[PDB]
Design a protein around this ligand. Sequence first.
Ligand SMILES: O=C1NC=C[C@H](O)N1
Ligand SMILES: O=C1NC=C[C@H](O)N1
Ligand SMILES: [Fe+3]
Ligand SMILES: [Fe+3]
Lengths: 423, 423
Amino acid sequence: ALQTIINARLPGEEGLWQIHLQDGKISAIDAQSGVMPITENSLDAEQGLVIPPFVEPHIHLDTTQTAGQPNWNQSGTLFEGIERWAERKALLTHDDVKQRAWQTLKWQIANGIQHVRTHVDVSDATLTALKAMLEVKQEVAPWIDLQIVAFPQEGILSYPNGEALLEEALRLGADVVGAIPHFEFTREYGVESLHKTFALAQKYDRLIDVHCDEIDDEQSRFVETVAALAHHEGMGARVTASHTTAMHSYNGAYTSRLFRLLKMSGINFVANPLVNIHLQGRFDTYPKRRGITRVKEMLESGINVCFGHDDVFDPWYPLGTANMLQVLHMGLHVCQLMGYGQINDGLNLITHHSARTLNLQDYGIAAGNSANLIILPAENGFDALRRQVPVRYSVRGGKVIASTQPAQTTVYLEQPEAIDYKR
Amino acid sequence: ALQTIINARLPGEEGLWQIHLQDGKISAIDAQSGVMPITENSLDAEQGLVIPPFVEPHIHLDTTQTAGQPNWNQSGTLFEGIERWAERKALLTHDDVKQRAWQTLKWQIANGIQHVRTHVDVSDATLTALKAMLEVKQEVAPWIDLQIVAFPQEGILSYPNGEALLEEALRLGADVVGAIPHFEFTREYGVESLHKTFALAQKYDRLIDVHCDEIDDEQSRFVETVAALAHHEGMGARVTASHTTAMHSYNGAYTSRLFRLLKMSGINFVANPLVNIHLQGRFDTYPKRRGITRVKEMLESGINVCFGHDDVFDPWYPLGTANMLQVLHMGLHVCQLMGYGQINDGLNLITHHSARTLNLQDYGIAAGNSANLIILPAENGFDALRRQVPVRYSVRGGKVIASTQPAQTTVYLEQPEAIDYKR
Ligand SMILES: O=C1NC=C[C@H](O)N1
Ligand SMILES: O=C1NC=C[C@H](O)N1
Ligand SMILES: [Fe+3]
Ligand SMILES: [Fe+3]
């Protein structure tokens, strides 16, 4: 029966703050002039940072926890990954998908993630994973708001009954329409697939999230069609272009021309640093390109960009604990957003920007919003990132749904000394 | 009441010539065997060069004299330029446009330019500059034949009511249909915009002049659609592709294939050396590309190419005195047309080739043509270019409309000595 969050630090704000809770919502936020005493019904943030929940804007829960089954992706490429997944997709069962999705979802709850957008492969006449994921969505609702993207992994026009299956997925309840233009047989199929994707999103009033130009091909420019169609339909807010790794390889003049449209369109962008650094640059010898989209430039231009984990122990990525601060750490390094302020502001890439990408309507520490927030045992975004701190408490609807008792390290010198890695 | 131009040198001809004038036209041209005596009603070219008037095939009189208002183009790019112009376009007034256009037109008259093609931005529902320019066209007619290009600066398909405004501009009297495919949101809009541009030109019987591929993007190939559509409609002579700076970055094999079509199509090309060297190569670090289209190769292939000033003290260019010999000087250097003959023949790039680009029907020193010609105090094209000579006399309809008394330089050595920089 929590009534208040006290001694809280807030990004971009000076001092400590008190967050009053009432009926599962935030009733008011007031600044404090000093440290407040703890008491019953008060959750002490202990001068730690309080922020809305971490968000996972791009993950594949249907493939999670399947790395090496039946075989391993030896080349470390997107293309072999799809082929290795195809082998596993043929062996899927309802319970298998639910068990694995839930295992990763629990790690996400433990990591303060209360909003997740999972893509689900719908290039499968049986739609096995989709049916399973729709049940998981209902089951996990008390802890995570899960969005499902109908993702035509093998193409819309390049796979038998691809468009029909994509629409069937929407009729069954998928929240977002997906696409993968660079994987279609031809550039023309790629462009046409986007017109079909947008028509379905308008027909069913759904969001859009395209696996867009995930390839080191300077000629892969499907992103301009995604942005142009969004601008034409006046629906930028509901549209997302995931990856756009090809943008890392575009010449600067085209990119500058393109950026005007990206900003005017208002669409969202997702970069997946852990997976992008691994799968991109695989066709170069030396030097080897990084392959992440132009994150730094998007931020400088006011274009909404955010980070996703993409994969957790599957054909496209053998690692992960579904930790967003870890995803952010990799992104800041590869994108060279290493200035103090850029690092400190990094939290935006895994909180607010991701919420906008998911078109969330109830997100942020503000009066009237649901009492969904997490507490990090750190002074600010920089500190949280540097020390890769766990989530001390995760609060949803005004109730604690996860907590982590921090590790305790001691070094035995002339006398025992506690080490917290702070300066 | 001039009756004859005597002691004239002509490009590509040996000796001196006499040009007889009658009723505002050239009645006959006869070679002289020696120097002729001056007399009343005879304009003595004094063994200087006589050529048809200089031509300005590409300039923006609606933006001229506005550099820095309200702000300066800090990046020196085409893209920021459009954005800086957009700010100024919002502050345009009828008289403002007329005053500035006239200021530059007077410099052009002083510089022996009697034919000018100005682009006018018609991505403006009020069409303020266009209405002003249509009046300027009538006002300046006694001295300059002004062609107006309806230029959809912000795109045809990418700007609200862009196509409607473009057609309205033609209905109001614009002589040429413009376009800017590389600025459209997508490659498909770019190609479609060209089909619409050609349809309007045929519907109204107007010329075409496209701002074509003005970008350092090796994939910007709208020029092939411009040339193909012209060939299909059998209208090459009436079509111009301005800039084509992307051609500077094409691989050689595609360029060779393309050149066959360029020659067969018969379309015209305009290079704008002063502006191209400034705006192109801005996305390179080092080495930095020059960015002018393939002028030297076009000349070698018999493809009509010419030079324009493009901008005079505005968002895309802070300098200029609207001087064509200066434009030519820059072009010869950057394009490496530095052989004696190439330099001497350089005048063609600012006279005859530009007249063909404007589809002029009354141009050249020939019997029957209007008596429009200028006199340069130089021995040939090479000499005129090297010394950047002024226009001694500009004659139109057989009357002097401009004259420049040359500067007089003296050095005071053991005795005073006149210096004319000749060898
Ligand atoms: O096409 C893809 N499938 C799964 C992961 C990666 O994001 N790309
Ligand atoms: O698009 C353009 N507008 C003005 C000058 C330059 O020629 N390009
Ligand atoms: Fe993905
Ligand atoms: Fe121009």
